[PDB]
Amino acid sequence: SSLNQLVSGLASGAVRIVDLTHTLDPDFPVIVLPPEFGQCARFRMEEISAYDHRGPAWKWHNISMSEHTGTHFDAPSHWISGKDVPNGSVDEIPAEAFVGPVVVIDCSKGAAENDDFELTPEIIAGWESEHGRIPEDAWVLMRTDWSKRRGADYLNMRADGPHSPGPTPEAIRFLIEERNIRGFGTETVGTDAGQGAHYVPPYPAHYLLHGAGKYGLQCLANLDQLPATGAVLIAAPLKIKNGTGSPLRVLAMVTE
Amino acid sequence: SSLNQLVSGLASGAVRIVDLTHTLDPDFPVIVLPPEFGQCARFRMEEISAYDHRGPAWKWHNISMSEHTGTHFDAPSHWISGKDVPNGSVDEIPAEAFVGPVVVIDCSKGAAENDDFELTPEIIAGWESEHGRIPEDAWVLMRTDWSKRRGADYLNMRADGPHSPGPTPEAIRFLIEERNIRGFGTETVGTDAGQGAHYVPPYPAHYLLHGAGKYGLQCLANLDQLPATGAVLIAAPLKIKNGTGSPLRVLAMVT
Numbered sequence: 001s002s003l004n005q006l007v008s009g010l011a012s013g014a015v016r017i018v019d020l021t022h023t024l025d026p027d028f029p030v031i032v033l034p035p036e037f038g039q040c041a042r043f044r045m046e047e048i049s050a051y052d053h054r055g056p057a058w059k060w061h062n063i064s065m066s067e068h069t070g071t072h073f074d075a076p077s078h079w080i081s082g083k084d085v086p087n088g089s090v091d092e093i094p095a096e097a098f099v100g101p102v103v104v105i106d107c108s109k110g111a112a113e114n115d116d117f118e119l120t121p122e123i124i125a126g127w128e129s130e131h132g133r134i135p136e137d138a139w140v141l142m143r144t145d146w147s148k149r150r151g152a153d154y155l156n157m158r159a160d161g162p163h164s165p166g167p168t169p170e171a172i173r174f175l176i177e178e179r180n181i182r183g184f185g186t187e188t189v190g191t192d193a194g195q196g197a198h199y200v201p202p203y204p205a206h207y208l209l210h211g212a213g214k215y216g217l218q219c220l221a222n223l224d225q226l227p228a229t230g231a232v233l234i235a236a237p238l239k240i241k242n243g244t245g246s247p248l249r250v251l252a253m254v255t256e
Numbered sequence: 257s258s259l260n261q262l263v264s265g266l267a268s269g270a271v272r273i274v275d276l277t278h279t280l281d282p283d284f285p286v287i288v289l290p291p292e293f294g295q296c297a298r299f300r301m302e303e304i305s306a307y308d309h310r311g312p313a314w315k316w317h318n319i320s321m322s323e324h325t326g327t328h329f330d331a332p333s334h335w336i337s338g339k340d341v342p343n344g345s346v347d348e349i350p351a352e353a354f355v356g357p358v359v360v361i362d363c364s365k366g367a368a369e370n371d372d373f374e375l376t377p378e379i380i381a382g383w384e385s386e387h388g389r390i391p392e393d394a395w396v397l398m399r400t401d402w403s404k405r406r407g408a409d410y411l412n413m414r415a416d417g418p419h420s421p422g423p424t425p426e427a428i429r430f431l432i433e434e435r436n437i438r439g440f441g442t443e444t445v446g447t448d449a450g451q452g453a454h455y456v457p458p459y460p461a462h463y464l465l466h467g468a469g470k471y472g473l474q475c476l477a478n479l480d481q482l483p484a485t486g487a488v489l490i491a492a493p494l495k496i497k498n499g500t501g502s503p504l505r506v507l508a509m510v511t
């Protein structure tokens with residue numbers, strides 16, 4: 001069976017698990033929005049006990065964050081256009097959606113030359129000319145190697161807001177309507193470009209993906225370790241009551 | 257590849273995914289300890305915006321809880337016996353540990369007749385007579401259907417503390433030393449029995465599992481959906497800096 005073979009390959013290393021997750025840490029950057037709006041929180045942790053009088057044989061912590069802190073998953077109810085999608089919160093998404101095929105589009109060269117690099121229909125067509133049609137119900141990850149930025153260059157805020165790569169409205173429309181993807185993931189804090197408020201419609205990845213019942217992943221790491229095709233993504237969010245998203249441990253299984 | 261077969265089996269329904277997780281909810285019970293100790297927090301959530309003046313096109317929340325709230329994973333650094341284990345925190349555990357074979361020992365009939373039911377070496381031996389030995393580096397789940405208890409029946413507190421099933425020290429030692437298991441999971445708030453402070457050593461599942469660099473799962477649901485053998489568990493904890501555990505979404509793939 002595929003599962004018996006999977007177990008054997010995982011045990012030998014013929015199938016490797018790549019962790020695509022950043023550490024949840026108080027100093028890891030989170031999305032910043034215009035100052036009139038409520039803001040995403042940083043991760044925070046505090047000891048309950050540490051093998052001391054408060055708990056002599058154990059150590060454990062209280063934790064707090066936002067649904068959108070760190071490496072995290074976006075459900076359709078996160079956007080106003082997804083507010084009527086069935087199974088639209090993280091606690092209702094069917095579990096078969098948490099494991100599936102993934103394709104990785106390498107935009108790292110373009111992102112190194114232009115902070116506002118755009119994933120376009122033409123680039124997707126170029127990718128499919130080499131790797132074949134994107135399979136139905138796949139995750140599509142836009143690799144940029146942005147996850148290697150370790151300071152203020154990660155959010156990359158300028159006077160008019162953040163400058164980071166993302167998809168155009170036409171790219172997202174193509175992936176949804178012509179390829180029926182499961183979701184879209186990036187290495188930045190947004191599935192939209194940093195300047196995505198100025199597309200038509202604003203924040204088109206969010207507006208269109210979630211309006212169509214599709215999912216988002218943000219702040220992925222280590223996409224340069226993945227093949228363009230053939231890997232399997234594990235992206236199971238926390239089962240938050242009526243939740244719009246969650247931090248999560250994103251993994252890819254890779255044949256090697 | 258074994259991955260292309262998996263993808264097409266998930267798409268066709270030949271492979272199914274069972275969710276083994278309880279919803280994170282302020283009302284779901286969390287572990288309660290003697291009152292002189294620090295306590296686990298309940299899950300809490302509050303809106304940042306809900307398509308409103310605070311965020312006109314989006315809805316999202318702040319959340320708070322403990323590492324050990326809800327369906328959750330225990331890393332070896334959670335116990336004092338785990339102090340000298342390498343890679344003992346949830347952000348350091350090798351990722352291959354997060355997907356693996358699982359076996360399920362059905363103790364539901366015993367738990368229905370004894371709140372303090374004990375999984376013993378004898379019960380494990382009976383299971384192995386039927387199913388063959390527990391595979392090396394497998395997750396072992398003690399099924400009790402305790403996850404069907406709601407409200408106060410789930411913690412099941414009495415004047416002498418909580419009454420819920422769990423393993424004996426000898427059962428855990430057998431699984432670690434003779435079968436080299438990866439970890440142990442239950443449908444209760446602890447990998448130990450509710451009255452497990454009274455074993456030698458106290459809380460032996462925690463003490464022995466984490467002292468051996470092994471993992472725990474607690475508050476699992478839906479274990480009655482799983483076969484005794486052949487399923488694959490997905491249990492990937494949040495990547496908390498130096499974390500001792502985390503809430504997580506536990507799943508099982510079943511053929």
Ligand SMILES: O=C(OCc1ccccc1)c1ccccc1
Nearest residue numbers: 162189190191192193194196314
């Ligand atoms: O990603 C969106 O902003 C795009 C973006 C991308 C990068 C940085 C900042 C913003 C977003 C997410 C949640 C709420 C509102 C907007």
Ligand SMILES: O=C(OCc1ccccc1)c1ccccc1
Nearest residue numbers: 058418445446447448449450459
């Ligand atoms: O596993 C027990 O507590 C161990 C423990 C001690 C301190 C912290 C975490 C875990 C347990 C089991 C059932 C009910 C209550 C407690």
Ligand SMILES: [Mn+2]
Nearest residue numbers: 068074218245
């Ligand atoms: Mn988000």
Ligand SMILES: [Mn+2]
Nearest residue numbers: 324330474501
């Ligand atoms: Mn715990």
